[PDB]
Amino acid sequence: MKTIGLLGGMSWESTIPYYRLINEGIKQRLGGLHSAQVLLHSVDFHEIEECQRRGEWDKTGDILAEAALGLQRAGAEGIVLCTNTMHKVADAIESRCTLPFLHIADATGRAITGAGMTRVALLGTRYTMEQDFYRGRLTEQFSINCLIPEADERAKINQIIFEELCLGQFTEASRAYYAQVIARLAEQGAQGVIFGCTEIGLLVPEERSVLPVFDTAAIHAEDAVAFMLSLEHHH
């Protein structure tokens, strides 16, 4: 199998699901005691998140591209970045590291396409929801349009990510708030909902969403498994 290189700790709480799901996918397909060949670089998220707030995106591109290179030198054969937000600097990683880069939004857009949807709600950090880098790739590459929450809702969704989810706190008050925002975007005509921060699936079970759920972490892990075993779109 090919060795996958994970760029994680953004936050580490959602890196665990990547590692669990990639190992479980390999076990399911190869059987026995087979497990995944993984190289992981986990950052100190404080530095990354501080750069987000200071607008020092180029510095984060440098940190993550050097990390990807480190994993390549240890034998990684492709790169998975365990965070939607930091695909804002995917270009720096892909420019520097010659490995196949499994873009999280491409895996998600393939899933939404297969569901036959073109108008979906998008929950994530405020960067992912408000800026161009994530939604613009979905529009340009898949002709998928995203509805995002109202400005007050977005502030609260974003505060819950950084002040609770990345700290391991999964409260019913926040769960209910997310579910209410999803229901409101369903009222606005959303066909599905993208859990477009990799921590969101730790808070909101699919049964709590009135919309079909595209969990970016789970879809990205399945993408990595297909790449490692050269299956389906990676054959």
49 binds a second copy (CB under 8 A): yes
- Alpha-carbon distance 16 to 18, whole Å? 5
28 binds a second copy (CB under 8 A): no
Q: Compute the distance between CA of residue 201 and CA of residue 152 in angstroms, rounded to an integer.
A: 21
Instruction: Considering only residues 159 through 188, tell me which ones interact with a second copy, judged by CB under 8 A.
Output: 162, 166-167
Alpha-carbon gap, residue 162 to 74, rounded angstroms: 32
44 binds a second copy (CB under 8 A): yes
Using rule CB under 8 A, residue 150 touches a second copy: no
Name, in order, each residue with C-beta under 8 angstroms of 225's C-beta and a sequence gap of 6 or more. Answer: 21, 22, 25, 26, 29, 36, 231
CB 89 within 8 A of CB 64: yes
- Please tell me whether residue 32 binds a second copy under the rule CB under 8 A: yes
3-state class (DSSP) for residue 39: strand
In this structure, the dihedral spanned by the alpha carbons of residues 78, 70, 42 and 22, taken in order and rounded to 10 degrees, is: 20
Q: Does 33 bind a second copy (CB under 8 A)?
A: yes
Residue 51 a catalytic site member: no
On whether the CB atoms of residues 123 and 195 are closer than 8 A, the answer is yes
The reply to whether 41 sits near a second copy by the rule CB under 8 A is yes
Closer residue to a second copy, CB minimum distance, 117 or 166: 166
The angle that helices 216-228 and 104-114 make with each other, rounded to 10 degrees, is: 100
- Binding range to a second copy, per CB under 8 A, among 28-36, 131-139, 175-183, 184-192: 28-36
Asked if 214 and 18 count as a contact pair (C-beta separation under 8 A), the reply is no
Q: Choose the catalytic residue: 15, 51, 82, 83.
A: 83
Amino acid at 187: E
Q: Provide, rounded to whole angstroms, the least separation between the CB of residue 215 and a second copy.
A: 19
Nearer to a second copy, 40 or 157 (CB): 40
Tell me the per-residue interface mask from 6 to 25 with a second copy, x by CB under 8 A, - otherwise: ---x-xx--xx--xx--x--
Residue with tokens 């019913």: 172
As measured in angstroms, the least distance from the Cβ of 138 to a second copy is 28
Q: How far is the CB of 32 from a second copy (least distance, A)?
A: 6
**Is 98 a residue of the active site?**
no
Q: Which of the residues are catalytic?
A: 83, 197
| Interface contacts to a second copy, rule CB under 8 A | 1, 9, 11-12, 15-16, 19-20, 23, 26-27, 30, 32-46, 49, 67, 70-71, 73-75, 162, 166-167
